Amino acid sequence: MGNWATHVYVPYEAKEEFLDLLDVLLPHAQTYVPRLVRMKVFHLSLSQSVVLRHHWILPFVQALKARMTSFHRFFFTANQVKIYTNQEKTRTFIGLEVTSGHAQFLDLVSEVDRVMEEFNLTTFYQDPSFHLSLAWCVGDARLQLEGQCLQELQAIVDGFEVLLRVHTEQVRCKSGNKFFSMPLK
């Protein structure tokens, strides 16, 4: 039956224009940290990765659908490069932090958090920072990526919509190997 890894997020469309930007940005970051790996799919988290008993997957998804489908779509900006780690500092990420639209993400998280509480699951991180992860590596590479590298990554981005005005259209829940989609209003 089992308990399934469950995660709620906004998917981010990997358009050619965005992937072409990564074609310039990520090799530059790899001159500092070659073992960075490009993300294959792109998302902005709305929940922690939690564990949910199997028989509650479908009811959890339906609860999310009910809430999300009355939530209005919005625009956001994600053009600020940031280095961050996972909680245990065994992985490092290069991401794009949301500026404009952060408050609307907080409102989405409020709704997701209520579903988490309904199913006795962990609510979102205190002091959250919404971001689109672009690449990751094992270990804590903050010392190598922050400073000169980060300034040059920011310069590449500043030199490039795609990032300025992204429209949220859907919310998705991954549970184990299952992916459940829903439209915003």
Ligand X SMILES: O=c1ccn([C@@H]2O[C@H](COP(=O)(O)O)[C@@H](O)[C@H]2O)c(=O)[nH]1
Q: Please name the residue that has the structure tokens 């509650």.
A: 56
Ligand-binding annotation for 43, yes or no, is: yes
Q: Which residues inside 138-157 make contact with ligand X, applying CB under 6 A?
A: none
28 is known as an active-site residue = no
Ligand-binding annotation for 113, yes or no, is: no
Q: Does 138 bind Cl ion (CB under 5 A)?
A: no
- In the bound complex, what is the minimum distance in angstroms from residue 24's beta carbon to ligand X? 21
Phi-psi category of residue 55: left, alpha or beta, with phi > 0 → left and psi -120 to 50 → alpha: alpha
- In the bound complex, what is the minimum distance in angstroms from residue 35's beta carbon to Cl ion? 4
* Residue from 129, 73, 69 nearest 104 by CA: 73
Q: Does 82 bind ligand X (CB under 6 A)?
A: no
With respect to Cl ion, which residue has the nearer C-beta, 137 or 173?
137
Residue 179's Cα: distance from chain center in Å? Answer: 15
Q: Please name the residue that has the structure tokens 């959250």.
A: 128
x/- site string to Cl ion, residues 34 to 73, per CB under 5 A?
xx--------------------------------------
Indicate which of Cl ion, ligand X, none lies near residue 35 (CB less than 5 to 8 Å, by partner kind). Cl ion
Q: Does 86 bind ligand X (CB under 6 A)?
A: yes
**Which residue in 43, 55, 72, 102 is the catalytic one?**
43
Binding site for Cl ion (CB under 5 A): 33-35
Binding site for ligand X (CB under 6 A): 45, 84, 86-87, 93, 95, 125, 128-129, 131, 133
